[PDB]
Amino acid sequence: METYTVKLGSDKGLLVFEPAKLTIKPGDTVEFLNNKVPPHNVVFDAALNPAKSADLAKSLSHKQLLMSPGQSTSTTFPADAPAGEYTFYCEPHRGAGMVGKITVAG
């Protein structure tokens, strides 16, 4: 089981997730770390995950904006997380491009 870190706001101050795509296994953890240019959150899309399950997406999301410097949240993917793409975005910055994608694979 592995932990992968995704910066919220790149080191260069861009409104992106750094990195914006990652491939992981079920059971792995993605740590989302408040980095630059607040405020950010992490909302998984309800339809764009392999089960098209709003409940799966809710379970992986952190809807609350991260309001402290270097605040961390993490999503440990279920053991039974289905293979495929999981689209997520930052709500405030969605229209600025702050969108990401996790692929779950074996």
If one asks whether residue 98 binds Cu ion (CB under 5 A), the answer comes out as: yes
Q: Smallest distance, Å, CB 83 to Cu ion? A: 27
Question: Where is 103: in which H helix or E strand?
Answer: strand 99-104
CB 57 within 8 A of CB 89: no
Stretch near Cu ion under the rule CB under 5 A, chosen from 27-35, 50-58, 59-67, 83-91: 83-91
CB 32 within 8 A of CB 62: yes
Nearer to Cu ion, 53 or 71 (CB): 71
Nearer to Cu ion, 9 or 86 (CB): 9
Closest CA to 35 of 75, 81, 90, 83: 90
Is 40 an active-site residue?
yes
If one asks whether residue 62 binds Cu ion (CB under 5 A), the answer comes out as: no
Q: Smallest distance, Å, CB 17 to Cu ion? A: 8
Q: What is the number of other CB atoms lying within 10 angstroms of the CB of residue 1?
A: 11
Among 7, 28, 40, 102, binds Cu ion (CB under 5 A): 40
Closest CA to 43 of 99, 105, 103, 104: 99
Give the footprint of Cu ion on this chain (CB under 5 A). Answer: 40, 90, 93, 98
